[PDB]
Every structure is written in structure tokens, then in C-alpha cells.
């Protein structure tokens, strides 16, 4: 442990306590390692995340994350997260690049983790870009800390994941669009933050909420740019009735044959959708996996076509 002697638990107040969440000195050997360890919380009751601290090598830590689930894919003290994230689904809470906004929570919104439901441990990914092969061992210990209580919260945050999974990438086509629409039927959502991922063919990742075919943006990036979580400049609330609908844009320019949307010899187009709701209607995931309105794409706005260099 570089030398930290900060405890994993720490108490606060009588309903709160901090949780160091830090690698246990590990030591990367090529630039681009991306390294994971979990850590259970503390409590078998729910309690809430309320607020996150970077901490970060200043001279290698280029992108951690912080995921919510039941079962890390491994036991040992830490990994690597090409072996997988979670077995189960792995919920995500909290992203940071270097010099990308953190995006804080906004103030009454929690994760709800522990209980019946909720998460059991966090996951922490380290992604370490810009290495030395002079650094013999180093011995980094980045990671994250969290401000959990057990005072119920009246907002509550989740992720809205919308994925594709039937289009399919011609090779040489200069331009392909995947399209995602699932309608919504929950209580209101309102969403504040949102990441994009996608393999290296993605060129723009653009989400909406269309309500009686009026297209409002929900945001709108480049998915090889660092890929954390960009607030929303006014929370978008999202309906009973709505539509929530996406749009990634990818090329097959230089690529010899078909690519999918399922692996690293495949892509991907996620669009992480971050939320809070009022908490007793809420709840911490929701996913959609569909193309539900296909034909409404024809009326989406010009700039979800327009590129983000």
C-alpha cells in the first residue's frame, strides 16, 4: 500500500462513512492496462452514494471507473478487465478521465446500493495510458473514494443502457447508421449525465427523447474522445408515453469485411443514459435493446448526422 494508511472504512457522522476504494499497489507493464479490483460494501442494509474524490496518479492515470453489482468476475486482490468487469450486469456510477469533467451528483440524489436490490459491491476499473519501462515496480494505488449514508435520499439516480444489436457494418459503406428505440413506461426520469461507447469505426453517438414527435437532444459526442460522463446542460425529463431514442454513426472505411454489433472484432453502440427519480417510484436500471420506432428515424434532426471531429 503506497505508504496510505487511511483505513477502507471510515466513519463520519452516525449515518455516514467514507470508503477508500484504491488498487492495491499494482504495477502495469505496457501502456493501455486496464485494471480492476471490487470491494463489498461494508452494510448488508441500503444505503446511498452520495458524492465521489478522484484520486489519481498525476503522471499515468488516464481513466477510472466505478461500477455497482453482485458478482465481480474475480476474487484475488485485482485483475485484468479484458477477463470481465462483472459476471453479472455490471452497473455503472461513476466515470473520470483526466482533464474530462467529473460531473458531480446533483444535490439530494443518490445511488442506491445494498438491500434486497441494491448492489452489493463496487468494481473499480483503472485504465493506466503512458507508461516508462524505467519505472521497474512503482506501485500505484489510484482509485476512488465515496461518500455513502444510510439517510434515505429523495432522489435517486440510475443508468438507462441503450444498446444495439442487429445492424451490421458493410465494409467500404462511408457512413451506417444503428438506431435504438424503446418506448418509456416508468415514472419520470430526469436525466443529467450520459456516456458514449463504441469501438474504433464510431464516429458520433447522439440519444434523444422524443415526445409527440418533437426531438429533444439529450447529448450528442464523439465516442473516441475519453469516455465519461458529459452533463447535460438542463436535465431532460423523460416521460410516461415518450420515446427514448439514439442514433451511432459508424464508417467500414479501410475494413475488409462485415463488422457486427455484439468482442473487440466487433463494435458496439452504448449509450449510457445517467438519471435520478424520485425515490419511491425508482429504480436503478433500465436497458433497451430494440429498435422499437424505426420509421420516426426518417424525421430525426439534422445534426444527429452531423460529425464531431
Known sequence: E???????????????????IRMPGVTPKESDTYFCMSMRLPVDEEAFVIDFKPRASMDTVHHMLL???????????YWFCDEGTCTDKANILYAWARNAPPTRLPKGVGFRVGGETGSKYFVLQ??????SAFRDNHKDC???????????????????????????????????????????????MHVFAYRVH???????????????????????????????????????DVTFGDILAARCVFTGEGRTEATHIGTSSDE??????????????????????????????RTIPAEANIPIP
Open 2 to 20: 503506497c505508504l496510505g494508511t487511511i483505513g477502507p472504512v471510515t466513519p463520519l457522522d452516525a449515518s455516514d462513512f467514507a470508503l477508500d
Open 67 to 77: 461500477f455497482g453489482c453482485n458478482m465481480p468476475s474475480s476474487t484475488g486482490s
Open 126 to 131: 483503472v485504465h493506466y495510458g503512458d507508461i
Open 142 to 188: 489510484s482509485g476512488v473514494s465515496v461518500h455513502l449514508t444510510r439517510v434515505p435520499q429523495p432522489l435517486i439516480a440510475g443508468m438507462y443502457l441503450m444498446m444495439s444489436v442487429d445492424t451490421v457494418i458493410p465494409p467500404g459503406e462511408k457512413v451506417v447508421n444503428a438506431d435504438i428505440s424503446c418506448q418509456y413506461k416508468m415514472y419520470p
Open 198 to 236: 463504441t469501438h474504433h469505426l464510431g464516429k458520433v453517438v447522439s440519444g434523444y427523447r422524443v415526445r409527440n414527435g418533437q426531438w429533444t437532444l439529450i447529448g450528442r459526442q464523439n465516442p473516441q474522445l475519453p469516455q465519461a460522463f458529459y452533463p447535460v446542460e438542463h436535465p431532460v
Open 268 to 297: 458496439m453502440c452504448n449509450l449510457y443514459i445517467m438519471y435520478y427519480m424520485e425515490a419511491k417510484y425508482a429504480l436503478s436500471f433500465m436497458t433497451c435493446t430494440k429498435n422499437v420506432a424505426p420509421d420516426m428515424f
